[PDB]
Ligand binder design. Sequence first.
Ligand SMILES: Cc1cc2nc3c(=O)[nH]c(=O)nc-3n(C[C@H](O)[C@H](O)[C@H](O)COP(=O)(O)OP(=O)(O)OC[C@H]3O[C@@H](n4cnc5c(N)ncnc54)[C@H](O)[C@@H]3O)c2cc1C
Ligand SMILES: Cc1cc2nc3c(=O)[nH]c(=O)nc-3n(C[C@H](O)[C@H](O)[C@H](O)COP(=O)(O)OP(=O)(O)OC[C@H]3O[C@@H](n4cnc5c(N)ncnc54)[C@H](O)[C@@H]3O)c2cc1C
Ligand SMILES: [Cl-]
Ligand SMILES: [Cl-]
Ligand SMILES: [Cl-]
Ligand SMILES: [Cl-]
Lengths: 395, 395
Amino acid sequence: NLQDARIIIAGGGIGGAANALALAQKGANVTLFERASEFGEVGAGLQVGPHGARILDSWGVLDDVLSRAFLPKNIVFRDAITAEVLTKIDLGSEFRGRYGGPYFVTHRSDLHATLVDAARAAGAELHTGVTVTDVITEGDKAIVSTDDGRTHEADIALGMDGLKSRLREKISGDEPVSSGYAAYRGTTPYRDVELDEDIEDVVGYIGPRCHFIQYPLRGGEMLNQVAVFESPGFKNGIENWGGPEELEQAYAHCHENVRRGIDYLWKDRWWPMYDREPIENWVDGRMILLGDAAHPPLQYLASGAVMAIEDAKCLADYAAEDFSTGGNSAWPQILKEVNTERAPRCNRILTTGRMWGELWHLDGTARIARNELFRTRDTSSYKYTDWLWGYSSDR
Amino acid sequence: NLQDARIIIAGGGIGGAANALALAQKGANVTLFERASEFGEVGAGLQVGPHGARILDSWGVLDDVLSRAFLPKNIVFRDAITAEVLTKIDLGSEFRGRYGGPYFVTHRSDLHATLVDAARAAGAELHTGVTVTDVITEGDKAIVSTDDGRTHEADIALGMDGLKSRLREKISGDEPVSSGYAAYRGTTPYRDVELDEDIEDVVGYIGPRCHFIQYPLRGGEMLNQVAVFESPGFKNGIENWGGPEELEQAYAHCHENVRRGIDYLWKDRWWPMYDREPIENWVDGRMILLGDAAHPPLQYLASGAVMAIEDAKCLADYAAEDFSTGGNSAWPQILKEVNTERAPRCNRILTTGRMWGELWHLDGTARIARNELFRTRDTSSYKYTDWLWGYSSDR
Ligand SMILES: Cc1cc2nc3c(=O)[nH]c(=O)nc-3n(C[C@H](O)[C@H](O)[C@H](O)COP(=O)(O)OP(=O)(O)OC[C@H]3O[C@@H](n4cnc5c(N)ncnc54)[C@H](O)[C@@H]3O)c2cc1C
Ligand SMILES: Cc1cc2nc3c(=O)[nH]c(=O)nc-3n(C[C@H](O)[C@H](O)[C@H](O)COP(=O)(O)OP(=O)(O)OC[C@H]3O[C@@H](n4cnc5c(N)ncnc54)[C@H](O)[C@@H]3O)c2cc1C
Ligand SMILES: [Cl-]
Ligand SMILES: [Cl-]
Ligand SMILES: [Cl-]
Ligand SMILES: [Cl-]
């Protein structure tokens, strides 16, 4: 356990919250600073495969998250032009047996609140409206600066300040890499969505230069919808690219079931999709980058928040194992071993995820090939998914 | 049979020769005019699947063609960058049982000579150094004009004057459509080719914007090699595009086994690859277009000469069936019924063949998808090939 340990976490998204929870459950003294004046997340869906669900269960929060989640029976891929089913991933008891938990979907806001509440309950000291302005390592401590003029001492600090991380600048000068794709979301009362057939699955329509995803939330009462498309504005240097004037033309070539979806999306806000090139080293002295600060992906594998959750589990587990015997002096080795375990995993998600989205967005003969590949696969095989959903950091 | 019938054939390529043979075997009076001063073909390979081999057998010439041919055990597709086997089409006894004949390869020159010799033996009157300058229909006869100032009367005329057909202008004003790809050939003494492993198959290396094919000829004594690549010169308006200064860069990204091949090719001559858009109607009065004049493909399905051979069989069979009972008056109906049977078949080859070559030449994620599609297929299935190799015109 981590009783005598002190950890400061810079950032209170899903990542920082999950780390606060995992560390406080080991008995660590955890202080978390969040920039925003309240804890919160977007009131729309995310997907959490068994690689995240098993970890939530270990922390004792999965039952509760599920009480407010939805349990899809399958992930279903459809052609966005014809609406034809291409393939399904069965998320039933064999899936759950194999991977040690369910594949679920829920509101980001609910998952985030659940984590924050559990971290507090476990002893974490969370602070809102506080920005971490610097982290340095001096001797055997991290020294953390905040925007109220204070400095704080801890054993280690976690840089969990997201895609636009400034703490990352201590290690890398890279900038976010634009995908040229933009994401829109919507949640609609389920019954207000014009549906030809009801939805109890995660449905992904994949088409030339676009996709469209639907899934139920909150026990089937709401439908989450997500539209991702290639922005022509981006290729022309528009700074504020991907705006809603692009949506109608971006989908004009798709099936009516996809085109009807667009009307339900929120149009006041969107998410231009960026990632970063993979980096191996996430550690600067007694600071480690985790979550999107270390490994921000494009969302094709629906695993960014899951990776941040995995990060928490690995950090807490490896530290509790080694700090007990080696104390504070052991922290740099612990960070190194966490980085060595996590980088190959997460960097494969970044890179493979780019290829996976490309595979979705093919046109022409390439689309013909992709459709037939999906149709004819051995659905009993897990070779395309075991690397993702079957990973564990357990040593 | 066709005893009282008179047919004039404009063109003496593989198509015209095969039609001369098929018609003369039915007892028709056949006169064939060829522009060139000698009958001949290129001294390099072509492939003849069972859809052509069965027909040659019916005419009694397959045994003889085979005595000078090669019988590959498989068609083998390899990735042009890695040289990895992707899939094989087994050409063994089950294949031959299914499709009614062998898949063989031979010299174009030999097949052509064999057909010409057999057409002569069967009674066809062949003439070299004679160009057909016009064909018109007057009453119940075709009237054919030649470049020695003569005119000739027949019951029907076949326009078999190739990709650059002028007779086609009677029916369509279309021009050849450039693929932007160019083909080079070579034959090398088998033993002079630097081979890591010996070849007893048709091998197709398929890569980004290029392919490379090898197969043995003449009982394994020579190796046929064919290089097809996307010409940058074409996209820049070079009239004489696809020249050999393009070959080295076109293959630079390929595996050594492909790159070594280029040195063996003839560099003095090449074949810029054109086809035509499919047309339904091939008949103008008592003239019918057949062979490349009617349906010139890109060569990805290795079936252009085979289609011309099929044309001959259908024409001869359908005419012999109906002329016997209806005489000369029946010829326009016969041509219509031959056109109705042949156009959907051949036009599917034109169109599908374009998609098939595109499938070969994919890059990026599309190539990744295509490779995996090929690898994982049900090799016991014939669904990708029965339309091609299992067709018959028999009614
Ligand atoms: C359209 C879309 C769909 C997605 N869907 C899925 C999905 O289905 N499943 C999945 O697992 N993932 C998904 N993701 C990925 C997931 O959203 C992210 O990977 C994940 O939320 C990252 O969490 P984080 O805590 O590392 O970073 P963030 O969520 O960015 O949190 C960083 C926090 O740090 C705060 N902050 C910033 N700087 C400072 C500072 N200096 N001091 C203090 N606080 C600071 C910010 O206010 C923010 O609260 C998706 C992403 C997108 C864009
Ligand atoms: C690189 C390449 C590879 C190929 N490989 C294969 C393969 O493996 N298998 C396959 O089956 N097919 C293949 N083909 C296709 C095949 O070559 C052609 O489809 C076929 O040869 C066409 O035969 P044809 O008799 O209709 O026309 P052509 O071969 O063009 O013959 C037309 C003839 O008419 C003559 N002529 C022209 N105008 C006149 C006139 N006015 N009067 C008299 N004579 C005239 C010409 O001199 C010529 O001899 C390939 C083609 C290419 C380019
Ligand atoms: Cl993601
Ligand atoms: Cl992801
Ligand atoms: Cl051809
Ligand atoms: Cl062809």
